[PDB]
Design a protein around this ligand. Structure first.
Ligand SMILES: Cc1cc2nc3c(=O)[nH]c(=O)nc-3n(C[C@H](O)[C@H](O)[C@H](O)COP(=O)(O)OP(=O)(O)OC[C@H]3O[C@@H](n4cnc5c(N)ncnc54)[C@H](O)[C@@H]3O)c2cc1C
Ligand SMILES: Cc1cc2nc3c(=O)[nH]c(=O)nc-3n(C[C@H](O)[C@H](O)[C@H](O)COP(=O)(O)OP(=O)(O)OC[C@H]3O[C@@H](n4cnc5c(N)ncnc54)[C@H](O)[C@@H]3O)c2cc1C
Ligand SMILES: Cc1cc2nc3c(=O)[nH]c(=O)nc-3n(C[C@H](O)[C@H](O)[C@H](O)COP(=O)(O)OP(=O)(O)OC[C@H]3O[C@@H](n4cnc5c(N)ncnc54)[C@H](O)[C@@H]3O)c2cc1C
Ligand SMILES: Cc1cc2nc3c(=O)[nH]c(=O)nc-3n(C[C@H](O)[C@H](O)[C@H](O)COP(=O)(O)OP(=O)(O)OC[C@H]3O[C@@H](n4cnc5c(N)ncnc54)[C@H](O)[C@@H]3O)c2cc1C
Ligand SMILES: NC(=[NH2+])NCCC[C@H](N)C(=O)O
Lengths: 454, 454, 454, 454
């Protein structure tokens, strides 16, 4: 139903990225314009001029970490529509019904679909917006624009994207921009660059290209102790059955993720209001107090599964140093030799406490998480539009960043999505509040036009 | 939206009973007439003349067995709309959203709502049809009618109902009837009539009236080993903390209900087709082979809970004969003395194998299940409209009973709901297929009118 | 401590088979002779002359079905000593302590060790009796003996065993014999002999020899729906990742094993008394009523795991006929073509109801359970010592078979172990009562000598 | 077997307290002297002169917190003997066997006995040492003694105890002392003294005496968010069915206890060596990093149970302020009015963040945990025997406190048990290492005598 806008026309909304965050906005807009769900939508005149720019060739949801068997870490009810409107055609349950699979999923008695299934649910959602999404487009910069060039008022933005295949630059003009680009791979600064040192985000993509023979006796190390590291470490024994694997962590042990009901309530959509209204001190204190819900934590079932495997090695061999798969707690990497004639790097280890063994490995999987600062690069040319002296983007409750009112028209603005954890809570980078947030976003961006019909 | 029909007018549909079975038909009709869900509904002219007759004063779902804590025995996905259309406003999830309770239910991580909650979900559904439901109306008979009295063709039915409060008889004429009246309480024929002998269906209703003091030291017996007996036996220790309870069963032990996924697939809506198409031999054989999914079975968690309580008695006292709460396996009642001057009846027991103890009790809770033959009484006057010599109602796949084509107009008919287990499967008397069956029913009854618009 | 008896000497006890049943007798005897556990053992004079004959080269516990990951189906508390005496050095917990593994097993929070671990526990037990066990000895016949050849009284037995490696026959004389030889592989009589048709008992042993390349695209069928079939079917997708597998069952679905607490109590050691004392009618009726505890049943977790895998195939492909791993319910094999030039047999299928597809397979795994009648062949020459006209062995409560008192001395006898399900219950062929039964056996066999010391 | 020593004689060991810690020492000594378990014990000459002093009238294990239904928070394998020797007659499993209850406990499939059952297991253990335990004896002071009064060398200690019933002081002389007195109730310093303000440790003891009518409509508050608070809060709705309850916590939510396998390994007996050998910095850092295993945490099942109850209140009433049972997160008590004429105290609340409601309550249950500094009072007169200038007791690895070698004979010493968390780990105050620690203690105290026999 959402028809495309020609590249040359001034858009109402331009969204950078087409992952879950932007997809949920697209769904919310569809629903707000659906007369079947929003009775006032029968009176809307023109369709808003909207466009989504995605750098991937097609919709994919963390494809490099689509480890076989890997499950969702959130209830399917927290899909892209249900918490806002269970009547929506974009719910996970309606998707299953459409695929002829609803009765079968029911028989599984689980709230946790496979990652592979949930990606397909979101792929199914994404495809219905193909006319308004430009794939293979990496946005490189956002530039302020003045429709009256002689004035001192900014009232639009130019979004410039590089074609991933051809390398050419395109420009699209919009009144309002949304940055929903997720996070970048975080690597420890001490580790050197080498094709054998690969971030977890590229596990399914890059590793099989490097270690082509699945039956060879490789030595493979994993750095980290989060969900990503545990998943890779568990997968390696299956993917490379004859390989010797090592898990290197600086903590003493893998620790369970906390989804206990009372604690879990921080992820409730209505709690964003309460969290935002807290002071910087209480917000920082609150984030630290509830960290075990999301960061440096592993799902209990996975910890137990790994532990069980470790015990089975003990049954077969009482000598820990002879085990095929090992875990080295409270260790840090101090040096990596990678200029030797052999295919194996040499990793020097020490205690993580305030010296130890050396490992020879064919590959080092680095599962050290993500940073969320990629938007900063894209927004460098619009920095001067912030209030004088303010050197950081300040998102409001509605995610619209603060800009000097005397420099920027009220019709122009920039919204940030999925990088606002410090201001909005631990549900910000997740799927938790996407259905509800998407609806709030549509009301914040298209509210004026939707009021005319209401 | 469904407007009432005056009592004097010829109805298109008259439904006897307004429990889940009829409620799901009402919901399906609403949805078939909703242009938002069925695009062809924009062209329908007149609303069908429909009426539901319910004997209870208001909607209640097995209120006599609303034991505190009692849970659902089926996934909430198998509600009254979802398996047919997850977009419907009558889904369990939309209900929760409407009550402002969806995020909270999500945090429970359960597919099994409390019975109390699910009744309220269905109460919420039922209330939106209050204009087309006549409460306090017990249907007593269905009578064949001929619009041309001199002809030999029946083309309508008179439905006669007794007002529960006033005792007066009313009559409503309809082309099509649905009998969806559930089941009647089954009592062992050997047990005599006494106010102290109460069926499980009346546990919350009748027992507190008989045993008014909750702190008194009563002796209370429970007969049976199904879900009802286990629930009552478990509840009694809480409801009457100082009472001595006994569970009398003829089996050796309580046995778990089977909801293992492969086995559970017999409850799939599309399987009704496959089950109906089987022969009488294969259907009888199939029902017997899968009995542990529904009959004489208890949910595992409840069995374990009871067992745990029994063990705690063993910790406190190694003498089984001194226990406050006891279970007597493989026993049958042979005689009940109930003419003695005391308040306690005397129950004589024997082995159930092809003699034993005597119990003195203030009340005997009889949890011996249900029969489904109440429709037979209401349909006695229409029996002669069946094909010559046929002494049982033969429901088709679409639940319409066979009638002689030369005696009954094609516009007239009678449908049976919830009593067709032998022909339609073990999902027939349950909630399992209600959403889908309701939709099939609407197509079978109102199909002609809905085709004109489609 | 148990010293060996020379082959030529008259033994007090000769045991045929050294599996769990006989191992538990050996342990019980050790414990009865241990002054630390039985205070009267300080006064015993001579060690009884005992010998165990085992056909396997060394102790192994169903080695052909040691599928990777396969777990125990019984609590570790029901090991070979604990239920009789938790102080015994032969308990599972003491074994773990001896291996330096007790604290680690504790951290697993499971009552269900790996099959591989529990076999090693029993191997550990078995090794301490190596001096009184003759491995590589297959017993072929038991012969009545008369120390006075001119009399008509039997007072000993000759046990004849064939050396598995050399083929020679040895003879050992004993007053008392125990037959504890477990069960033989049951094959459907309709299936023809072929190296590609293999019983489940030989899965780990025989299949890898036939299908040597684990990466080849084989077609592999599994017949059955018990624990063995489910385990093999689940394992095949891992063992042969590129092979197309089929599960052929005559039932409609895999059904869960019943270990619900009240029901499980039939396995209690003290219940053997109660079960034995029942009539043939009640025993047959009782066995049939509780069949789901042991036969044609699969552990719930495994059913769910398989079901989950099947659903994952549905996610990837909605076409069931294209799935790599398939299950064909309610089917029976009617013909097997196996004289064709290709490596694949052709299996003709029909409905199991009172016609279907053809499968081409490289191997057929037959998981159709076991028979327990091997003792009959070994006892043919002693049949005439039973009471006149009695054509079946009648074991007493103490497992000693009935023999004519005028033909057999009171000092001579034959005991049956693990084949007495019809007389002793569903715990007879299991590990359930082994600790307690072993102790009863020692008292039944060595009671006279142990009374002198007591 | 352990015979009593007359009060006047010099003891080898005097133990202050007869709870789990001391009980495990008694058991270890029994086992070390049992020739059946320790082969060298056949050669020991004299029984050591040992005595245990307990202030309670008889053995009781946290009797004031024996809330109905309350379960163990540790595997039964970590009983008072098993991890040291599974052959011991003092194991939990042997206890069950002795009570005729082993097969039944097995059928529960749980590692977590009821608190009531486990106390009875330890009561059963304790009774076999009744001849060497003096009940009703509260130790008040430990005094250094010099057998040569003119010398400057201490070589014994006088232990002085007050009879709880009569008030008289008794004195017992010993070479070696063990202080195993557990912890004292910790109350917030801001709360005033009042009979209506009761510590959790006295919940079952003191509250029913204050609130005698269980059916009255009381207002009852609970302060805290640990296991104790959750247990009391959950129990109150059952114990006082018509009472309005409030949970006051300064944290945002109840948080789950961590027993994930890898993390749980800190509780392994052999890990005490590794923990003790760490520096003060690493030990403090380690304790803080693993706090969620023991402190301010609730068992997941209990959190969920409470949460479920809270949701059921939401079903019945959407207004949180009308709920019978409520939880007030992030609150602190600032003032308590308790001089008013009514029976209800007035509690003034504020936010716990760096103002709120007032509660009127009949009782305030204070579940604010325990302190472990009671030994300091008893050891004041022996303080000067520590090395010059050292103002804190420094326990060695073997739990023997450091004393000046020139002041104290090598035959004299004082050991601390259950208060050494800072030096020995999080397993110190628990049941976790009691079996193993008890054995280490016996070797540390009676080692010289046991070497003569070995
Ligand atoms: C392996 C993994 C599994 C997870 N699973 C869960 C889960 O089970 N439940 C849960 O609640 N949370 C989960 N998360 C958290 C995760 O952040 C969210 O599920 C989700 O990815 C957030 O969506 P987003 O759109 O904000 O970011 P993303 O999903 O990363 O979407 C960003 C998109 O923008 C595109 N993009 C980036 N830069 C540019 C550019 N310059 N120009 C154009 N396009 C660009 C990217 O290609 C990407 O498609 C998971 C995270 C990971 C890494
Ligand atoms: C205690 C209990 C709990 C259950 N819980 C579950 C569950 O968890 N999940 C599940 O799938 N199945 C469950 N069932 C099965 C149950 O049959 C269905 O949930 C459901 O009740 C079937 O609906 P129905 O309309 O066919 O029958 P009913 O629900 O019995 O509805 C029949 C209605 O017709 C009315 N009526 C009867 N006779 C007349 C008359 N002569 N005139 C007018 N009105 C009349 C009655 O008042 C009643 O309201 C349960 C059954 C019981 C007894
Ligand atoms: C794969 C599998 C797994 C099982 N797991 C469980 C479980 O988890 N828990 C449970 O309670 N039950 C289980 N069982 C049931 C099983 O019957 C018992 O665990 C156990 O094997 C019974 O011991 P047994 O000594 O009676 O028979 P077996 O264990 O079969 O021992 C018989 C021994 O006698 C030897 N023998 C046979 N014939 C001769 C001869 N002519 N001469 C000399 N020696 C001979 C055999 O080599 C064998 O070693 C399992 C069964 C199978 C097939
Ligand atoms: C309610 C509760 C439940 C618990 N449950 C668990 C559990 O499930 N698992 C677990 O591992 N840990 C648990 N714990 C931890 C607990 O500390 C240990 O289980 C155990 O109590 C430690 O034993 P102890 O002998 O060191 O201390 P205690 O058990 O407190 O024993 C001290 C004894 O010394 C006596 N005493 C004190 N002062 C004197 C004196 N001056 N003179 C004479 N006698 C004195 C006391 O009467 C008492 O009997 C629990 C703690 C509490 C409060
Ligand atoms: N199929 C099975 N699960 N067999 C094992 C049965 C063991 C039995 N439930 C017991 O506790 O002793």
């Amino acid at each position: 139903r959402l028809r495309s806008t020609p590249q040359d026309e001034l858009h109402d909304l331009l969204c950078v990225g087409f992952g879950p965050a932007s997809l949920a906005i697209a769904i919310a807009l569809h629903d707000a314009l659906d007369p079947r769900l929003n009775k006032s939508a029968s009176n809307i005149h023109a369709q808003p001029k909207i466009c989504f720019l995605e750098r991937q060739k097609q919709f994919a949801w963390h494809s490099g970490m689509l480890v076989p068997g890997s499950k969702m870490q959130i209830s399917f009810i927290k899909d892209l529509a249900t918490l806002r409107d269970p009547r929506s055609s974009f719910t996970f349950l309606n998707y299953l019904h459409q695929k002829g699979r609803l009765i079968h999923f029911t028989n599984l008695s689980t709230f946790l679909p496979a990652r592979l299934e949930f990606e397909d649910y979101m792929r199914w959602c994404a495809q219905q917006f193909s006319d308004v999404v430009a794939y293979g487009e990496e946005v490189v910069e956002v530039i302020p624009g003045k429709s009256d060039p002689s004035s001192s008022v900014v009232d639009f933005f130019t979004v410039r994207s590089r074609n991933v295949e051809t390398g050419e630059i395109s420009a699209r003009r919009t009144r309002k921009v949304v940055i929903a680009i997720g996070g970048t791979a975080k690597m420890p600064s001490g580790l050197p660059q080498d094709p054998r040192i690969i971030h977890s985000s590229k596990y399914c993509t890059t590793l099989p290209a490097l270690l082509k023979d699945k039956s060879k006796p490789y030595n493979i190390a994993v750095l980290g102790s989060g969900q990503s590291a545990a998943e890779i470490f568990h997968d390696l024994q299956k993917r490379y059955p004859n390989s010797r694997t090592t898990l290197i962590m600086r903590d003493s042990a893998m620790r369970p993720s906390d989804d206990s009901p009372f604690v879990n309530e921080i992820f409730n959509p209505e709690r964003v209001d309460k969290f935002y209204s807290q002071s910087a001190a209480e917000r920082q204190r609150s984030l630290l107090a509830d960290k075990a819900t999301n960061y440096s934590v592993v799902r209990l079932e996975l910890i137990e599964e790994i532990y069980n495997d470790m015990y089975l090695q003990r049954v077969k061999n009482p000598d820990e140093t002879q085990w095929q798969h090992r875990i080295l707690p409270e260790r840090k990497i101090t040096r990596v030799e990678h200029h030797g004639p052999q295919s194996r790097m040499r990793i020097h280890l020490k205690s993580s406490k305030p010296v130890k063994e050396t490992l020879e490995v064919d590959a080092l999987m680095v599962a050290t998480g993500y940073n969320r600062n990629a938007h900063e690069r894209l927004l460098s040319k619009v920095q001067h539009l912030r209030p004088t002296g303010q050197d950081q983007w300040k998102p409001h409750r509605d995610y619209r960043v603060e800009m000097d009112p005397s420099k920027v028209s009220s019709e122009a603005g920039i919204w940030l999505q999925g990088c606002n954890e410090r201001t909005h809570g631990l549900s910000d980078s997740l799927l938790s509040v996407l259905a509800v947030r998407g609806g709030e976003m549509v009301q914040s961006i298209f509210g004026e036009q939707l009021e005319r019909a209401a």
